[PDB]
Amino acid sequence: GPLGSGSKIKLEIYNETDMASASGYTPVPSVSEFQYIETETISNTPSPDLTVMSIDKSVLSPGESATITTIVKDIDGNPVNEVHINKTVARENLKGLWDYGPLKKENVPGKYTQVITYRGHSNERIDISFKYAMSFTKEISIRGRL
């Protein structure tokens, strides 16, 4: 019969803390901080490549005005505090009654706006060359609707 028995005493482990509570929570996400150039802006460099200076209305009725929207931006794409903008009138006729108001310089970042008014005397086109800072120059189109 089977006499080759082991009779070995099973050496076992006492409390091995096998079970492990699941640590599965994270810390807080990284936040932000305050901003500069909000008041004490720096004299950096602008670049109209990232600037939106346009007017989408080549129509001027006797009584209304067209406002050209120029938002100047830096070369880095930040809000320009302010630049210089001059007018330049490209005209063929003198029959037209083009009312050129002053350039409205608002408290807004890079946003310049100017209202060009027209009286219905003639029906032609007039382009206004906006001379920015002594670096870049642009030009917009005003069209009189008689």
Q: Are 112 and 72 in contact (CB under 8 A)?
A: yes
Tokens of 88: 């330049």
Approach to solving: NMR
Q: With the CA atoms of 145, 129, 87 and 63 taken in that order, what torsion angle do they form, in degrees rounded to the nearest 10?
A: 10
What is the radius of gyration, based on Cα positions, of the chain? 36
Q: Which residues contact residue 92 at a Cβ distance below 8 angstroms, ignoring those fewer than 6 apart?
A: 124, 125, 126
Dihedral angle sign, alpha carbons of residues 118, 121, 126, 132: negative
Q: Among 55, 75, 51, which residue's Cα sits nearest to residue 137?
A: 51
Cα distance between residue 90 and residue 98, in whole Å:
12
Length of the chain: 146
Q: Among 47, 33, 34, 39, which residue's Cα sits nearest to residue 78?
A: 47
